[PDB]
């Protein structure tokens, strides 16, 4: 009943330890939601974009360790706004195993420092809202330690921002999604 898409920041600003912590965060969310009606898909972004597995591909091999372990960090600039657009258009397409009438969740894991993107958040959030994609945001590193990155997290987060911004150092985001999905 729910299609959860991950968009992970692989840019040069994500240190290797945090990028590890992103990998085990995503793996734990999938692993906790196996044997349920949740399908999963992942895109890594920096200035280039790699779909490491689609909704259809997770359906054919629902092993979170096997899907996440070979993921290697891209580095480079931070094209977050373009990354948002590609997830909505490519990952949440029926051709990739996404379901039309499902609960659409995007999980963005970044440090909140878009850099070099030709697109703005103002240009991509209406597209996400049009498909009913609920957007959760996981701040990493020093994301919460500068006023610029914090106010960025609200712009990307869903309409009640207080329900949708969390940290990667805990799994409070997963509990909120689980409580959300149980309500659904």
């Amino acid at each position, epitope marked *: 009943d729910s299609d959860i898409a991950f968009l992970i920041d692989g840019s040069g600003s994500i240190i290797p330890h945090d990028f590890r912590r992103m990998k085990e965060f995503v793996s734990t969310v999938m692993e906790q939601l196996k044997k349920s009606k949740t399908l999963f898909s992942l895109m890594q972004y920096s200035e280039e974009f790699r779909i490491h597995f689609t909704f259809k591909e997770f359906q054919n091999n629902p092993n979170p360790r096997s899907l996440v372990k070979p993921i290697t960090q891209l580095l480079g600039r931070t094209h977050t706004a373009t990354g948002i657009r590609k997830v909505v258009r490519e990952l949440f397409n029926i051709t990739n195993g996404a379901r039309k009438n499902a609960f659409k969740i995007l999980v963005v894991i970044t440090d909140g420092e878009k850099f070099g993107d030709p697109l703005g958040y103002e240009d991509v959030i209406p597209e996400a809202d049009r498909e009913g994609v609920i957007r959760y945001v996981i701040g990493v590193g020093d994301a919460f*330690r500068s*006023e610029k990155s914090r106010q960025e997290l609200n712009t990307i987060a869903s309409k009640p921002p*207080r329900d949708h*911004v969390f*940290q990667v150092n*805990n799994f*409070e985001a997963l509990k909120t999604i689980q409580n959300q999905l149980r309500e659904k």
Partner: nanobody
Amino acid sequence: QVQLVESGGGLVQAGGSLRLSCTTSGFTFDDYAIGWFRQAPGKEREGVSCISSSEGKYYSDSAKGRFTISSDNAKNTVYLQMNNLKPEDTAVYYCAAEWNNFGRLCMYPDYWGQGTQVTVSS
């Protein structure tokens, strides 16, 4: 029960300094990150600073370099030392608390104090 009581406000000349105090009670002090917000009337609201035992310290762009947030863990009180104050810093200063296990450094506080007036004149 839950209280967040601001004190240390008032009128100060430009270039002066003030130390605000946020004396807290009615909750376990260590479970929460405590932060400072401000809103002058007819102006937008701003985050200023926050202190968490696990996530460290946060300062807004206007606050960094001038301001210092600190915590007296024994008396459950958080202080904001504000140096080099300016007339544009005139606002009602609120202290607030957020459950620290979210790890967000006071982005969405769960409790708000009543606020105290800080005035900065030339």
